Structures are given as structure tokens and as C-alpha cells.
Symmetry: C4
Amino acid sequence: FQVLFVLTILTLISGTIFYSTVEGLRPIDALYFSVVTLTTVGETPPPQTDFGKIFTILYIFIGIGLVFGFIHKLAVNVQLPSILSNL
Amino acid sequence: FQVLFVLTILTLISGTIFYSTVEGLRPIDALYFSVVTLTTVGETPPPQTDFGKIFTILYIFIGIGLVFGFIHKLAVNVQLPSILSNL
Amino acid sequence: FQVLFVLTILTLISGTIFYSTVEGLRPIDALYFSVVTLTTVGETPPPQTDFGKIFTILYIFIGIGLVFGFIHKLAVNVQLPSILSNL
Amino acid sequence: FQVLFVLTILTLISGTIFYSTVEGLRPIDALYFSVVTLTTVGETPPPQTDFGKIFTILYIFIGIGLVFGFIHKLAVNVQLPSILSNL
Ligand SMILES: [Cs+]
Ligand SMILES: [Cs+]
């Protein structure tokens, strides 16, 4: 749980630094982009540079599998007993 | 089935109150946003305030795992026999 | 495979009729909306009527679980041997 | 791992050629579209031609199941030992 959390955070900071610099976004926006992209929500306009597109493509292939491993444990290995056992 | 339904509804009402107040959306729109976000459909513009972005980020990590647990039972534990057994 | 195909097609035609009439879309667009919504791709603007939003909300909860059951068999129960066995 | 990689790449090149020609996109954009669509991220405007919509519909049904099989192995069969075993 701790390990997947670390990998997820590191993946998110890479994305924040990438998009803040190459796409010119304010860090809160580059984090938001990173997050809604790896979670496949996507409620954003696409990157506008060719370098942003290519990176986004590679980021999704590598990052999705991690982010979603993390979310299974987050809900299904921490919220579950918490919530379930009250019941 | 009843329990996941409760947690889902509560997650959705939190989102409705959040976005109606901070993003200024009419409640039907704040519910729609909440729903299309946790289901990762996302066919909306992003939140426009920094507080909306941060909350959306935390909401997705916590909420997705629940919403999708709920949907497995909804289709796969209620529609299945209903539909299957006619066949 | 045949059964999930039927349920999916019926779900898609409901959506086509719904959005063509209430959202005023041409049938090809109401089908496209229906499809990119149940698959959570979502690369569309949101519905614009309150009745469209509510229906979209209910449609996603009921429809997603079916559409994705169908897609597991489509790739994983028809394309798999086809492709795998050449190899 | 090698086989799913081949099928994924071939699926992506079909999409690149399709959208570059029928939707008129520059190849980097037609690849980006293809990728964010099969991964259900979708942070793009929809196709604008009827032929683009229909193809997109068929592309998602056939392509998603493959792309996501590929991503399970990518993170869960190559990044896992790499990362896990350092720990
Ligand atoms: Cs989207
Ligand atoms: Cs999406």
C-alpha cells in the first residue's frame, strides 16, 4: 500500500513538472491534467505541443497500470474494512 | 448491494453539495459532474477554481473504487439473473 | 456471446432514440454519444437538457456493466483464439 | 508480451492512417486521437465526419479489449518485478 503510493506520487510529480514546463501550465493545473489523464477521466483539452502529445501517449501506457493498482488498494484495502466493519 | 448503494449515494451527495457551492453549479449539474467524473466518462469542462481541482483530485481517488464496486453488483448481481434466467 | 450482443444492441438503440428525440441529435450522433458514454471514452460535450442529464446518469449505471461484459467476450472470447492460434 | 505489443501497434497504425486521411489530421494528432480513445481517456473533440464516427464506434469495440490486455502486462508483467524487486 505504501509502495504503490510512492510510485503513484512519483508518477504524478513527473507529470506535474512535465506539463508545467512544456505545456506552460501552472503546477496545480499540470497535476490536475496528470491525474485526470492517468485515471482516464480526461475532462480537459488536449496538450497543444507535439512534445506534449508524445509524452502523454507514453505516460498513459506506463502510468495507468500503476494508478489503477493503487486505487484498488485505496478503496479495496483501506476503505473496505473501515466501512464494512462499522456494518 | 444495499451497503455499496448507500456509500455511492453518500459520495454523490457530497459531490453535489461541493460543486453546487464552490463551482457555483445548479444541483443537477453538480450531480451530473460528480457522476461522469467518478465513472471516468468525463464529458464536461474541468472545474475552474483551484479548490475545485484539488477536491476533484481527492474525490476521484476515494470515489472511483466505490462507484465501480457498486456498478459490478448493479449489472452483475441484479441485471444478470433477471436477464439470464429469461434465457 | 450472442446474448450480451443482443443486450448491448438493445441498450444502444434505446440511447439512439433517446438522444435523437430529447437532445435533438441526428441518429448517427445519438449513437456515437451513446457508445462513447457507455465505454467511458466521452469525447463529446455534455447533454444540454435536464432530462438528458438525468437519463445519462441512469444510462451509465445500468449500461456500463453490460457494455464492458460484452467487450471482454468480443476481444477475449473471439479475437483471442483467432489471433493467438495463428501464433 | 511481444504478441500483444504487436497487435496494439498494428491497431494504432490503422487508426493513425484512418484519422489522418478521413479526418484530415496530421499523423501525430491521429495517433494521439487513436491512443486517448482506445484507453478511454478521450480529451479530444469528437470526429466530425459520419464516416469518422462509425469507424470510431467499431474501433473502440475491437480495440479497447486489446489495448487494455496490453497495459496489464506492461505495468503488471514488466514494471512489477523491476520495481518490486528493488524493494
Ligand atoms: Cs473525456
Ligand atoms: Cs473519459
